[PDB]
Design a protein around this ligand. Sequence first.
Ligand SMILES: CC[C@H](C)[C@H](N)C(=O)NS(=O)(=O)NC[C@H]1O[C@@H](n2cnc3c(N)ncnc32)[C@H](O)[C@@H]1O
Ligand SMILES: CC[C@H](C)[C@H](N)C(=O)NS(=O)(=O)NC[C@H]1O[C@@H](n2cnc3c(N)ncnc32)[C@H](O)[C@@H]1O
Ligand SMILES: [Cl-]
Ligand SMILES: [Cl-]
Ligand SMILES: [Cl-]
Ligand SMILES: [Cl-]
Ligand SMILES: [Li+]
Ligand SMILES: [Li+]
Ligand code: NA
Ligand code: NA
Ligand code: NA
Ligand code: NA
Ligand SMILES: [Zn+2]
Length: 921
Amino acid sequence: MEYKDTLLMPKTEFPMRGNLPNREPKMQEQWAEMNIYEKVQKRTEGRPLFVLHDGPPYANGDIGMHHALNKILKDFIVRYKSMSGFCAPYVPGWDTHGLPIETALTKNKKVNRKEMTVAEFRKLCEQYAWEQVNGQREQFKRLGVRGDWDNPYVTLQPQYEAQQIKVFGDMAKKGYIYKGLKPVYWSPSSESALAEAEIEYYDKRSASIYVAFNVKDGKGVLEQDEKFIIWTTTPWTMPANQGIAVNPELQYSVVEADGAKYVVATELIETVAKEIEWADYKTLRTVKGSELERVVAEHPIYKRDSLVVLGDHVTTDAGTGCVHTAPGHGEDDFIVGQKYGLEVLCPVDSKGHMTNEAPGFEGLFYDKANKPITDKLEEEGALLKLSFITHSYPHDWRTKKPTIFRATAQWFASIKDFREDLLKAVEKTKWVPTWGETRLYNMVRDRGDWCISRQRAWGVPIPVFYAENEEPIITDETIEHVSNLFREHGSNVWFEREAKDLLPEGFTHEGSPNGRFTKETDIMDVWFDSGSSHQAVLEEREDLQRPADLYLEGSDQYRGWFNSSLSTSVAVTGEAPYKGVLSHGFALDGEGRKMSKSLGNVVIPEKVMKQLGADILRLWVASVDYQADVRVSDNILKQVAEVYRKIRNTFRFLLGNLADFNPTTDAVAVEDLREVDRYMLVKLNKLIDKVKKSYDSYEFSSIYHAVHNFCTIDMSSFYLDFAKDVLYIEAENNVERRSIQTVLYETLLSLTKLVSPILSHTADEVWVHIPNVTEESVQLVDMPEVQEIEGADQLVEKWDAFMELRDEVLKALEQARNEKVIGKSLEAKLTLYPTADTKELLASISENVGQLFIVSDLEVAEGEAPAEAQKFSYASIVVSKAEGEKCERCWVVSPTVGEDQDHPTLCTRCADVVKNHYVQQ
Ligand SMILES: CC[C@H](C)[C@H](N)C(=O)NS(=O)(=O)NC[C@H]1O[C@@H](n2cnc3c(N)ncnc32)[C@H](O)[C@@H]1O
Ligand SMILES: CC[C@H](C)[C@H](N)C(=O)NS(=O)(=O)NC[C@H]1O[C@@H](n2cnc3c(N)ncnc32)[C@H](O)[C@@H]1O
Ligand SMILES: [Cl-]
Ligand SMILES: [Cl-]
Ligand SMILES: [Cl-]
Ligand SMILES: [Cl-]
Ligand SMILES: [Li+]
Ligand SMILES: [Li+]
Ligand code: NA
Ligand code: NA
Ligand code: NA
Ligand code: NA
Ligand SMILES: [Zn+2]
């Protein structure tokens, strides 16, 4: 009414309280209308490419917090590269085959794969897959991610399957593919073989056994009264035992008597005494381990032959220097078994039940047969001690049930034949974090061959044919024929055609004179499907190239996508499929616990997406060290939401005070700016350089705190706090108010372009309220390039000290606020007694110290009388009342109020502004 004369914050087109959940979906609607991803791609069509290949997430179900972090971090890098001189094509993917889909249907939808045909079950997997890829893609958009969502890649597409066969064919012609009977992971629950990437370790209770092996033919070294000692945590492997292993040269064994003479390593006398609980024991003689070679023993239950063999695998750390050798259930047992030509026995079927090869335990599940085996051992008297231990045990990654080693005929990729080239690729790759290099390097030098065949249906079949010779037929013509056939009809054709209909039209092989061929039924590892992405996406698609610039996935992908993609590429190309790798940790509860439904700590993305929004989650991603494990909770997200409030209010302050500003020609020159404003320009450019550098180094935690510090204390509390009472009161064409606005305009333009990769819904919302809009969205302009400011270093030293001094003045004002008598910074006059250094800085102030300290008046004298007021380490201060007339417009207590006849209640400053007008109004 009468007490106010406008001069407030006009531009409220950007609301204060951020209702992003109801506003962001509309923001994404316009993004889809304009096809912004195609626009930015077209704008940079000639710029150099930065390819961030997207790791294909599984379609097992809805998205989680971990799914968001992987996509959001990818979105940060792609958006920055788009507006920094690079062309950034990002095509999303989805891994569609393998157990993660079959187990989802079996458990969630209660469908039995054995109650329907193989073709029918595959069709249901295909239907459930496209349901999940549609649901996941919409959820990713809600978070806010830019990519080729309408043209993604999936592993079920015929082009992907066709190219995957080529990858197998290229490695096969190199000789890197072979088939053999070897012990490998077997999951009885899934009735299929597995690999380390498909193995999850959990603690499991197992029965420790110390058992006796009678001596039959000591070869002049041992008498029949001696007995071997064997330690085993797998009783079910005893029926398959074909030998005993002991170290030939390093370890020497001795005979110990406790009423009977036993054979054990000398270094394990005390350890085996406390385990079997021996009372009194004595050592008879010593024997070098190599002397015990070819000694024949007897099976405790079947009294069959068991041959003592030499091996480097037997260790002192075991419970006994003698380890029972079962070539059909162990890797090291198989190697020494083949050296001595020992028979391979696997009395366990695919479902985990003992077969006729174990006479007394046929039909029993291997874990259910442990007790009967021990009972028979004690009946035979060969059992010495029975104990129980808990240790980490391999489990199926989907059924969560334990796995066992089984010696079966499987397809393998000969890693050993090109392991050296794999190690070279790791050394030549840039790994962030740095330990990722050693993580994969050790995984390569210690890895065996890769078992690729899986006894399941939903996946890409192995393209191998067998003649009447039963010889595997792998050749370029067959691979070419099946690859093109898969490109036309898909992998489904292999499961619906005879063997002769999948081969070339006139193919004949020497092994089958009658032309009767047969095909293979096993399928490929789902990690091979994801590992073939570089050939099927980076190479086939024109929008991408190989090698990609960056691979950004989780820590579990070192054994997964990182390993498989490198394995396939180096086998074919010899080089890495990526120039660099970035790794993120695991999402965790606020207390550090794993996010699982059992703990009730699950943070659903859609839950936060509707309670808080998208950019709040985007801020949280940049607020954590993604390179390690990251903690998330509702309270933590609320803290990030509070940060967005500060960013919201500071942005609104910039927009509000820039309403009556048009920098088309009202731009104050750099020299014409106030020295206070020039320092803020240097700080803005320093912030620009730090953010762009941190984007190159992917350190988003630095960016998150830098912007928060740049606004909470530097801008809102220091620079905007002063201009909160100065900008509008003065003239609308005053150089001071225009110079301050030019700083605010440049910060608004630069900061909006800076935050564009991290926050985009709020960035474009602010970009709407921009006086100069030459591009539709902030994502269409490049990042602000840093510009040097003359005399920056001198001003930085001067004004940082001035910023330091102001905070001490404010603390003195807050000390007056503690008194609360004046209770106002502007209504307070000041009498300052400064240090010579402080006085020198005040002398260097060519601006108005009173308006900077938002005080009515300031006087400086060397009074040096502390009294009882205050003294900062650089000045003595007196906060005094002015006692003049308070201006009704600027609220400054000034003696000049009443000097103007037309406006007797206004000071000279306000009276002049009200009376005069520049050109208008
Ligand atoms: C699938 C069955 C569960 C694991 C069940 N809770 C269970 O068996 N629990 S346990 O504590 O008995 N597991 C001990 C492990 O050792 C085997 N075992 C148990 N009792 C004996 C025994 N007397 N002699 C030999 N082996 C034995 C079990 O099979 C299990 O692997
Ligand atoms: C590149 C993806 C792999 C080829 C595989 N399909 C896969 O892991 N698919 S996923 O859907 O399970 N996960 C996709 C991404 O999320 C990471 N991830 C999976 N689980 C977690 C977790 N608990 N915490 C943090 N990150 C996790 C994966 O490493 C991958 O980057
Ligand atoms: Cl099943
Ligand atoms: Cl063992
Ligand atoms: Cl047919
Ligand atoms: Cl067939
Ligand atoms: Li025990
Ligand atoms: Li709060
Ligand atoms: Na059924
Ligand atoms: Na099969
Ligand atoms: Na077969
Ligand atoms: Na995984
Ligand atoms: Zn006034």
